[PDB]
From a paper:
The rapid spread of the severe acute respiratory syndrome coronavirus 2 (SARS-CoV-2) B.1.1.529 (Omicron) variant and its resistance to neutralization by vaccinee and convalescent sera are driving a search for monoclonal antibodies with potent neutralization. To provide insight into effective neutralization, we determined cryo–electron microscopy structures and evaluated receptor binding domain (RBD) antibodies for their ability to bind and neutralize B.1.1.529. Mutations altered 16% of the B.1.1.529 RBD surface, clustered on an RBD ridge overlapping the angiotensin-converting enzyme 2 (ACE2)–binding surface and reduced binding of most antibodies. The RBD is a major target for neutralizing antibodies in both convalescents and vaccinees.
Numbering used by the authors:
A (entry chain M): 1 to 126
B (entry chain C): 360 to 555
C (entry chain P): 1 to 27, 27A, 28 to 107
D (entry chain O): 2 to 52, 52A, 53 to 82, 82A, 82B, 82C, 83 to 100, 100A, ...
E (entry chain N): 1 to 110
Write the structure that this text describes.
């Protein structure tokens, strides 16, 4: 079934790194775009990492420019969110959402976030 | 690298305007011209004539301009039932504040807001710094003025060196054992035909 | 959203003064988003100085001032006879474009 | 350069309002039209800013509702309608339209209107 | 940078019609902004409700419908249900991948 499962959550000390894994089942990653959403409890969701279907370009938010890296493996349909320079406020529940496909000709500022999994949170404290 | 026949293209939606420039709508199948580039999209009805080879207008200089020496033409039919939604299908839109006149057949892709110079708006999207596009409405019912018209603009090149789509069609039946002329595949001749 | 409350009200001056026309700002509104409107009673206000940055195309010379984010000040020196009417401090950038109170000057 | 309003109005208190500002002297394909509120010996007030190109408008806090503005592509004009206001509004409306040519143009509203005399009474 | 205008929390009895609002602080809202409305049950995964201001998600009832209201995006709820009490979030589109979320509204059902 079309599902995005996030693995790699836990306690990472400040200043360290982590490669958060996102495994996709049912659909092909190269045909759809992804959205990374940070959702802290009791507050609003926030957009961090997004990648197009073809990986032709990289988009992020200002707070995460040059400090988080997202990479893809289309050979086996896998996603690797590399975490760098973690801080205590990064603790939130992260969801991976799926963007629309090129099979349907859609305009730019591509629409996405149609389906997403349970998500996984991170813990950065010392 | 295929043969193209628009004889079957006669069968389409009743709203069908087929006017072409540089070639009459009948003599293309026999011709052996080079590659062809097409692109299509659905438009508000009133300006289907505003789009044409190289005339002024709000839409001509912003998203699509058509060269005057236009080898090829447009094919337009009605897709109102294919496009209109009860609440309105918000899916189509066009550049509205381009600070230039877009030439025919160049890629024009951008998503940043228009800025009229003067003062540094710096992405506030307030006054004198507007965001173009400003999508259509596509009401479930409306007159032909804003009726979504599916129009394809098609341009085939020339110079005959890259033979791409080309010609020879319209075959003919056979005769035997009679003095006749013939052109089997491009070679001309005359005489009698026999089983060899 | 309206906290301008320009200091000059109705004060009388003899010709050849050191007049200082000042507008405040509600927020840290960028320059060129202000306007000084000269309304003669009976007709519409006229735009002379916008944002205290540069003058308009054609208007009287030898008066111009550059202002801060919340203190736009200009100097009037030896004004001509008919520059005696209500002055409007006007704000751009904000929705709505709230308007100022008005400044009166006259002679003893 | 030229911006024209209507003349004086004598109107019955409470159906709607009709008022126009038609501009010229500049390219009206991309510009602004500014409506304000003024009255004889009265505080100046702001109405709105609109264009003909596409719907992009905001109002003051007390004029958010009971208001319509039609863009009116033709003849380089803009219409304000459907006041449903009160009777004590014998006030001036004014109009404003800056000049533009090519897209990069002035920011201020120098070409002001002349004013309208709206009178609703018994 | 712009901020979407939203309300903290609502309280409406079941079976009624309520309006959810999201607007643009930088100017008037056009449909090119692609408003989107999602429900966030606390501690769980959100479910797609409204994208494009005129389309539901697959299987969503006719109760949660979005629209445009002046310079505000409006989501209409008819026939409130006990499950409708949830956190709600808006999405606005700045070109080439800038999705913006506002304050979020806790629509509680009495």
């Amino acid at each position: 079934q079309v599902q995005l499962v996030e693995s790699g959550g836990g306690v990472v000390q400040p200043g360290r790194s982590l490669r958060l894994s996102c495994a996709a089942s049912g659909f092909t990653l190269s045909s759809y775009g992804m959205h990374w959403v940070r959702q802290a409890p009791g507050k609003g969701l926030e957009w961090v990492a997004v990648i197009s279907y073809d990986g032709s370009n990289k988009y992020y938010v200002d707070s995460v420019k040059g400090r988080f890296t997202i990479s893809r493996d289309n050979s086996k349909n896998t996603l690797y969110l590399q975490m760098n320079s973690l801080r205590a406020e990064d603790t939130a529940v992260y969801y991976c959402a799926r963007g629309w496909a090129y099979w349907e000709l859609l305009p730019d500022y591509y629409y996405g976030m149609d389906v997403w999994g349970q998500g996984t949170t991170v813990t950065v404290s010392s | 690298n295929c043969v193209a026949d628009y004889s079957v293209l006669y069968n389409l939606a009743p709203f069908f305007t087929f006017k072409c420039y540089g070639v009459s709508p009948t003599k293309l199948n026999d011709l052996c011209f080079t590659n062809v580039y097409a692109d299509s999209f659905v438009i508000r009805g009133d300006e289907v004539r505003q789009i044409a080879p190289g005339q002024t207008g709000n839409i001509a200089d912003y998203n699509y301009k058509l060269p005057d020496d236009f080898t090829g033409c447009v094919i337009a039919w009605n897709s109102n039932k294919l496009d209109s939604k009860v609440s309105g299908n918000y899916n189509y839109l066009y550049r509205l504040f381009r600070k230039s006149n877009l030439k025919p057949f160049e890629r024009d892709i951008s998503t940043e807001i228009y800025q009229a110079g003067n003062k540094p708006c710096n992405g506030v999207a307030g006054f004198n710094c507007y965001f173009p596009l400003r999508s259509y409405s596509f009401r479930p019912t409306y007159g032909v003025g804003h009726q979504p018209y599916r129009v394809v603009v098609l341009s085939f090149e020339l110079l005959h060196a890259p033979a791409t789509v080309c010609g020879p069609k319209k075959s003919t039946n056979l005769v035997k054992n009679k003095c006749v002329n013939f052109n089997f595949n491009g070679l001309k001749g005359t005489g009698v035909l026999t089983e060899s | 959203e309206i906290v301008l409350t320009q200091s000059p009200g109705t004060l009388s001056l003899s010709p050849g003064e050191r007049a200082t026309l000042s507008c405040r700002a509600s927020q840290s509104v960028s320059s060129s988003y202000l306007a000084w409107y000269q309304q003669k009673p009976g007709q519409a206000p006229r735009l002379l100085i916008y944002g205290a940055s540069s003058r308009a195309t054609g208007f009287p010379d030898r008066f111009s001032g550059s202002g801060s984010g919340t203190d736009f000040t200009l100097t009037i020196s030896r004004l001509e006879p008919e520059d005696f009417a209500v002055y409007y401090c006007q704000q751009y950038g904000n929705s709505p474009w709230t308007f100022g109170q008005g400044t009166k000057v006259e002679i003893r | 350069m030229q911006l024209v309003q209507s003349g004086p109005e004598v109107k019955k208190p409470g159906t709607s309002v009709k008022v126009s500002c038609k501009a010229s002297g500049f390219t009206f394909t991309s510009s602004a039209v500014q409506w304000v509120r003024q009255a004889r010996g009265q505080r100046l007030e702001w109405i709105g800013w609109i264009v003909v190109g596409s719907g992009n408008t905001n109002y003051a806090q007390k004029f958010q509702e009971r208001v319509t503005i039609t863009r009116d592509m033709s003849t380089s004009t803009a219409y304000m309608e459907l006041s449903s206001l009160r009777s004590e509004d014998t006030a001036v409306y004014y109009c404003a339209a800056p000049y533009c040519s090519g897209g990069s143009c002035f920011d201020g509203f120098d070409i002001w209107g002349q004013g309208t005399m709206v009178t609703v009474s018994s | 940078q712009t901020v979407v205008t939203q309300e903290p929390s609502f309280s409406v009895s079941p079976g009624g019609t309520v309006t959810l609002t999201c607007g643009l602080s930088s100017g008037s809202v056009s449909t090119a902004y692609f408003p989107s409305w999602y429900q966030q049950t606390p501690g769980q995964a959100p479910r797609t409700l409204i994208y494009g201001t005129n389309t539901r998600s697959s299987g969503v009832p006719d109760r949660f419908s979005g629209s445009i209201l002046g310079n505000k995006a409006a989501l209409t709820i008819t026939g409130a249900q006990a499950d409708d009490e949830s956190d709600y979030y808006c999405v606005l589109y700045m070109g080439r991948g800038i999705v913006v979320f506002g304050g979020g509204t806790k629509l509680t059902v009495l």
